[PDB]
Design an enzyme around this catalytic site. Structure first.
Site, PDB file in Angstrom:
ATOM      1  CG  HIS A  43      -1.983  -1.078   0.758  1.00 40.97           C
ATOM      2  ND1 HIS A  43      -3.580  -1.333   2.275  1.00 40.97           N
ATOM      3  CD2 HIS A  43      -2.447  -2.057   0.187  1.00 40.97           C
ATOM      4  CE1 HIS A  43      -3.532  -2.569   1.445  1.00 40.97           C
ATOM      5  NE2 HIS A  43      -2.960  -2.716   1.020  1.00 40.97           N
ATOM      6  CG  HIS A  53      -7.683  -2.756   2.316  1.00 39.65           C
ATOM      7  ND1 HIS A  53      -7.235  -2.987   4.168  1.00 39.65           N
ATOM      8  CD2 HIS A  53      -6.536  -4.343   2.288  1.00 39.65           C
ATOM      9  CE1 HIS A  53      -7.036  -4.538   4.759  1.00 39.65           C
ATOM     10  NE2 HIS A  53      -6.597  -5.064   3.418  1.00 39.65           N
TER      11      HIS A  53
HETATM   12  C1  LIG Z   1      -0.438  -7.334  -4.812  1.00 40.59           C
HETATM   13  C2  LIG Z   1      -0.943  -6.034  -4.008  1.00 40.59           C
HETATM   14  C3  LIG Z   1      -2.557  -6.321  -3.656  1.00 40.59           C
HETATM   15  C4  LIG Z   1      -2.978  -5.397  -3.173  1.00 40.59           C
HETATM   16  N1  LIG Z   1      -3.908  -5.630  -2.452  1.00 40.59           N
HETATM   17  C5  LIG Z   1      -5.250  -4.462  -2.209  1.00 40.59           C
HETATM   18  C6  LIG Z   1      -6.294  -4.545  -1.391  1.00 40.59           C
HETATM   19  O1  LIG Z   1      -6.668  -5.499  -1.794  1.00 40.59           O
HETATM   20  N2  LIG Z   1      -6.936  -3.370  -1.403  1.00 40.59           N
HETATM   21  C7  LIG Z   1      -6.538  -1.831  -2.122  1.00 40.59           C
HETATM   22  O2  LIG Z   1      -7.312  -1.538  -1.474  1.00 40.59           O
HETATM   23  N3  LIG Z   1      -5.664  -2.257  -2.398  1.00 40.59           N
HETATM   24  C8  LIG Z   1      -4.581  -2.385  -2.506  1.00 40.59           C
HETATM   25  N4  LIG Z   1      -3.484  -2.985  -3.406  1.00 40.59           N
HETATM   26  C9  LIG Z   1      -2.933  -1.035  -3.347  1.00 40.59           C
HETATM   27  C10 LIG Z   1      -3.813  -0.783  -4.069  1.00 40.59           C
HETATM   28  O3  LIG Z   1      -3.963  -1.443  -5.111  1.00 40.59           O
HETATM   29  C11 LIG Z   1      -2.789  -0.209  -4.725  1.00 40.59           C
HETATM   30  O4  LIG Z   1      -2.053   1.495  -3.159  1.00 40.59           O
HETATM   31  C12 LIG Z   1      -3.602   1.767  -5.856  1.00 40.59           C
HETATM   32  O5  LIG Z   1      -4.357   0.092  -6.504  1.00 40.59           O
HETATM   33  C13 LIG Z   1      -2.214   2.432  -6.586  1.00 40.59           C
HETATM   34  O6  LIG Z   1      -2.963   3.300  -7.256  1.00 40.59           O
HETATM   35  P1  LIG Z   1      -2.592   3.636  -8.898  1.00 40.59           P
HETATM   36  O7  LIG Z   1      -3.071   4.347  -9.306  1.00 40.59           O
HETATM   37  O8  LIG Z   1      -1.974   4.852  -7.936  1.00 40.59           O
HETATM   38  O9  LIG Z   1      -1.359   2.793  -9.145  1.00 40.59           O
HETATM   39  P2  LIG Z   1      -1.374   1.907 -10.287  1.00 40.59           P
HETATM   40  O10 LIG Z   1      -3.229   0.852 -10.289  1.00 40.59           O
HETATM   41  O11 LIG Z   1      -0.419   0.933 -10.232  1.00 40.59           O
HETATM   42  O12 LIG Z   1      -1.588   3.160 -12.234  1.00 40.59           O
HETATM   43  C14 LIG Z   1      -0.249   2.929 -12.564  1.00 40.59           C
HETATM   44  C15 LIG Z   1      -0.467   2.666 -14.262  1.00 40.59           C
HETATM   45  O13 LIG Z   1       0.861   3.443 -14.670  1.00 40.59           O
HETATM   46  C16 LIG Z   1       1.196   2.567 -15.209  1.00 40.59           C
HETATM   47  N5  LIG Z   1       1.919   3.387 -15.890  1.00 40.59           N
HETATM   48  C17 LIG Z   1       3.092   4.013 -14.679  1.00 40.59           C
HETATM   49  N6  LIG Z   1       4.594   4.495 -15.409  1.00 40.59           N
HETATM   50  C18 LIG Z   1       4.043   4.802 -16.648  1.00 40.59           C
HETATM   51  C19 LIG Z   1       4.410   5.749 -17.706  1.00 40.59           C
HETATM   52  N7  LIG Z   1       5.692   6.096 -17.794  1.00 40.59           N
HETATM   53  N8  LIG Z   1       3.827   5.172 -18.421  1.00 40.59           N
HETATM   54  C20 LIG Z   1       2.771   4.569 -19.136  1.00 40.59           C
HETATM   55  N9  LIG Z   1       1.607   3.656 -17.647  1.00 40.59           N
HETATM   56  C21 LIG Z   1       2.595   4.159 -16.699  1.00 40.59           C
HETATM   57  C22 LIG Z   1       1.343   1.520 -14.679  1.00 40.59           C
HETATM   58  O14 LIG Z   1       1.486   0.832 -15.427  1.00 40.59           O
HETATM   59  C23 LIG Z   1       0.067   1.361 -13.950  1.00 40.59           C
HETATM   60  O15 LIG Z   1      -1.088   1.058 -14.740  1.00 40.59           O
HETATM   61  C24 LIG Z   1      -2.942  -3.338  -2.699  1.00 40.59           C
HETATM   62  C25 LIG Z   1      -1.603  -3.359  -3.999  1.00 40.59           C
HETATM   63  C26 LIG Z   1      -0.076  -5.154  -4.489  1.00 40.59           C
HETATM   64  C27 LIG Z   1       0.710  -4.552  -5.339  1.00 40.59           C
END
Ligand SMILES: Cc1cc2nc3c(=O)[nH]c(=O)nc-3n(C[C@H](O)[C@H](O)[C@H](O)COP(=O)(O)OP(=O)(O)OC[C@H]3O[C@@H](n4cnc5c(N)ncnc54)[C@H](O)[C@@H]3O)c2cc1C
Ligand SMILES: *[C@@H]1O[C@H](CO)[C@@H](O)[C@H](O)[C@H]1NC(C)=O
Ligand SMILES: *[C@@H]1O[C@H](CO)[C@@H](O)[C@H](O)[C@H]1NC(C)=O
Ligand SMILES: *[C@@H]1O[C@H](CO)[C@@H](O)[C@H](O)[C@H]1NC(C)=O
Ligand SMILES: *[C@@H]1O[C@H](CO)[C@@H](O)[C@H](O)[C@H]1NC(C)=O
Ligand SMILES: *[C@@H]1O[C@H](CO)[C@@H](O)[C@H](O)[C@H]1NC(C)=O
Ligand SMILES: *[C@@H]1O[C@H](CO)[C@@H](O)[C@H](O)[C@H]1NC(C)=O
Ligand SMILES: C[C@H]1OCc2cc(C=O)ccc2O1
Length: 514
Positions: free
Chosen positions: A454, A492
């Site tokens: 997280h 979460h």
């Molecule tokens: C294994 C795991 C289990 C988890 N389980 C839970 C859970 O059960 N419940 C919960 O609430 N939270 C959970 N989390 C945490 C939660 O899912 C994340 O904190 C949240 O999804 C992050 O969202 P975000 O939009 O910041 O990142 P992301 O959803 O990772 O989005 C970032 C996106 O940007 C893309 N990207 C990156 N750099 C570039 C670039 N230069 N050009 C183009 N695209 C790019 C990536 O490929 C990705 O698709 C979990 C995390 C993990 C890793």
């Protein structure tokens, strides 16, 4: 809870406006470019597309390429699978020496995560000092929840753990509730009651298919500037370069995650002046905080091996205090480890069904940073360091959580999962280090820490961004993803970041309607 999603197949209707980044006809001008098709980025792009022309650029491929992303049963497979640079799980190791993963796939981390769904702790909004439209926050949670969240069915292990948290004094009994509140509850899941994963990519189905275009295997390498963001350079799977721009009162939003957002800002010359100058990166906008205040909430855990088989479960039952958030999942054994479940590859593997019983430190107060490993190539992962337990308040909170896990192991609820009918928790058979005097708990916390997954920070509101998620000193540039806050919204956070993408989209559209 009239509004929650029903059991249904994963909705890939949006694939009608998904294209390979090799398509040069995507190059040109849009109202909005969103960088990162993940947790915040997908609902953001869908929401802007209601009124404006939107390009969503995602470095990964579509989830249909990796079917084990689309079921609860497949969770472990995606972490077990070797990282070949194409896979939905990208492996990394923090400089602290702790194995970790991030997503590389359209839908982002919602395609590979453990499915647990919660709304933010309602005190979070006032703690931020942001002037939130709280009615709109709640309408936006319902918009997400109607698409991809269910009320979970009964699972025997989750019910055992729930009874145990209650018996261990994690009160009150909150029954079924989406809210982050002290006590024990059944929360929502983004896995439906048939085990089908639902995710942020499905929120693209709420976009206007005449206005929204998505490019996949689009590696966004640089934000282009006029001081205003004007566009991006991205490369395709063949390695060729492509440009896209925003027009008029349009904006570029970075939704590339805790790791990808600071990385791209730094590569684009937005970041600390002495650091960027040290790398001969021309400084577009000096900001001493880009890639600073990067946080990973600690996971600490024991593993019990019951003498009779337990049914595998997804996490749905949460035990919440202000100083620790606890859950447990039950799992089949495996001979290939799911990368980052345990902090290193050198960890004993289970030969029988086991329960992973965990505690999460809130905050945390310990922070580190993201720095570049390459000054040019976005496909080269940045360095990341979290400094687990550098702050003694975090270590104290892990001690409290570990004693409560001791209380849970002592409950009548868990007694039937002991190997020996002795009085003590040594009656359990353990995989790895059992719980052990505050010093023994301190050693256990420090030695056996893992990532909760997280992680957040690196582009904080109040450091890099204003309260509207604008990059300070730059027009037409925003950041919306988990890089933005220095503390969790709840145990979460996917629920908060799904909501946040649409919320900020609505704030953009409102700001512009005037
Ligand atoms: C294994 C795991 C289990 C988890 N389980 C839970 C859970 O059960 N419940 C919960 O609430 N939270 C959970 N989390 C945490 C939660 O899912 C994340 O904190 C949240 O999804 C992050 O969202 P975000 O939009 O910041 O990142 P992301 O959803 O990772 O989005 C970032 C996106 O940007 C893309 N990207 C990156 N750099 C570039 C670039 N230069 N050009 C183009 N695209 C790019 C990536 O490929 C990705 O698709 C979990 C995390 C993990 C890793
Ligand atoms: C994009 O096209 C290339 C060939 O030009 C191919 O190798 C790659 O798989 C395609 N990617 C997707 C996501 O369709
Ligand atoms: C938002 O919904 C929460 C429950 O998630 C409720 O506690 C709160 O009162 C609601 N706030 C507003 C502004 O309606
Ligand atoms: C930056 O470039 C200067 C030449 O102008 C050179 O002296 C110096 O070594 C360079 N530093 C790095 C890290 O590339
Ligand atoms: C709710 O969030 C606030 C931070 O504003 C925090 O003080 C409190 O500990 C949280 N409550 C729970 C039960 O996590
Ligand atoms: C880049 O990452 C490698 C491999 O993990 C690391 O050991 C090396 O020191 C890093 N280089 C820079 C410039 O940070
Ligand atoms: C821990 O963090 C808190 C609040 O951020 C702060 O009061 C204290 O300076 C920190 N302690 C250490 C050991 O860094
Ligand atoms: C607490 C939770 O953390 C995640 C987790 C993953 C697996 C693999 O299926 C199994 C168990 C498990 O327990």
């Amino acid at each position: 809870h009239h509004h929650l999603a029903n059991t249904s197949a994963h909705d890939f209707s949006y694939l009608k406006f998904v294209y390979n980044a090799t398509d040069t006809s995507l190059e040109g001008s849009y109202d909005y470019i969103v960088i990162g098709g993940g947790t915040s980025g997908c609902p953001l792009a869908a929401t802007l597309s209601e009124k404006y022309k939107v390009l969503l650029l995602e470095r990964g491929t579509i989830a249909t390429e990796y079917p084990n992303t689309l079921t609860a049963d497949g969770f472990a497979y995606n972490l077990q699978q070797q990282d070949d640079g194409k896979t939905p799980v990208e492996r990394f190791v923090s400089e602290d020496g702790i194995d970790n993963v991030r997503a590389r796939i359209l839908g982002g981390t919602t395609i590979i995560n453990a499915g647990v769904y919660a709304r933010a702790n309602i005190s979070f909004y006032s703690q931020t000092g942001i002037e939130w439209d709280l009615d709109l926050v709640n309408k936006t949670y319902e918009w997400v929840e109607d698409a991809i969240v269910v009320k979970p069915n009964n699972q025997s292990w989750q019910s055992v753990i729930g009874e145990g948290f209650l018996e261990a004094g994690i009160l009150p009994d909150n029954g079924f509730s989406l809210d982050h509140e002290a006590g024990t509850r059944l929360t929502g899941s983004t896995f439906d009651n048939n085990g089908t994963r639902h995710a942020a990519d499905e929120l693209l189905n709420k976009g206007d298919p005449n206005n929204l275009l998505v490019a996949v295997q689009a590696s966004v390498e640089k934000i282009l500037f006029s001081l205003s963001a004007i566009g991006v350079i991205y490369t395709d799977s063949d390695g060729n370069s492509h440009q896209a721009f925003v027009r008029g009162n349009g904006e570029v939003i970075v939704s590339a995650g805790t790791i990808g957002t600071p990385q791209l800002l730094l590569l684009s010359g937005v970041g600390p002046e002495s650091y960027l100058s040290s790398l001969n990166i021309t400084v577009v906008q000096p900001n001493p905080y880009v890639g600073q205040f990067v946080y990973d909430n600690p996971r600490n855990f024991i593993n019990i091996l019951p003498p009779n088989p337990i049914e595998a479960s997804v996490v749905t039952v949460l035990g919440i205090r202000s100083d620790y958030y606890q859950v447990s999942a039950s799992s089949l054994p495996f001979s290939t480890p799911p990368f980052s479940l345990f902090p290193t590859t050198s960890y004993p593997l289970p030969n029988s069904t086991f329960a992973h019983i965990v505690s999460q430190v809130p905050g945390p107060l310990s922070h580190g940073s993201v720095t570049l490993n390459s000054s040019s190539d976005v496909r080269i992962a940045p360095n990341i360091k979290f400094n687990y337990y550098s702050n003694s308040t975090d270590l104290a909170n892990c001690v409290s959580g570990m004693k409560k896990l001791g209380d849970l192991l002592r409950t009548k609820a868990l007694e039937p999962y002991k190997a020996r009918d002795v009085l003590g928790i040594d009656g359990f058979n353990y995989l790895g280090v059992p719980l052990p005097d505050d010093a023994s708990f301190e050693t256990f916390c420090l030695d056996n820490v893992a990532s909760y997954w997280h992680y957040h920070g690196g582009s904080l509101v109040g450091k890099v961004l204003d309260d509207s998620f604008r990059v300070m000193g730059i027009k037409a540039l925003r950041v919306v993803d988990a890089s933005t806050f220095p503390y969790e919204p709840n145990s979460h956070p996917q629920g908060f970041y799904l909501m946040l993408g649409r919320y900020v989209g609505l704030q953009i559209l409102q700001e512009r309607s005037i």
